[PDB]
Write a protein that binds this DNA or RNA. Sequence first.
RNA 1: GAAUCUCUUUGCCUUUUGGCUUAGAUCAAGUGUAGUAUCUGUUCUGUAACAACUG
Length: 109
Amino acid sequence: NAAKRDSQVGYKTINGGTEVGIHPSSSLYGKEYEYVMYHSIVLTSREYMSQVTSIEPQWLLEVAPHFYKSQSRKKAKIIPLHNKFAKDQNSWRLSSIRQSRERALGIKR
RNA sequence: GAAUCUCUUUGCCUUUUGGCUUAGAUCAAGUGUAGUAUCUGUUCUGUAACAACUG
């Protein structure tokens, strides 16, 4: 039961990629560490981890080289920075410019 | 020596590039229907002689 701190969605689980969270009653709420292990986990309105400690990936390797030791790097994608003035953050694309052109001309595929 | 025809190099070029400026400048991603162009395929393969008249 360990967790990896992702910048966009907060925390991913090592098993299955479940978006979890730190409970505010814990000691580690206002602070952040990158790799943490959690004693318990509760499904509610939001996930919550309980008894969370900082951990280093050297320890997670030297203890368990049998549970584990790319493809997720290949399947990833990125999206640009968000602006308020654009009103649809896909309209910069060449596909969306093509679609807006062919809609204004009035053709249909 | 000289004429006629015909072929090689050698001359001739004889349908043998007729202005300028910011290369004068920009850009070639639309649907249907229609016109024009072209391009692939298949099969099959009366005449002569004799007898008579010259009108």
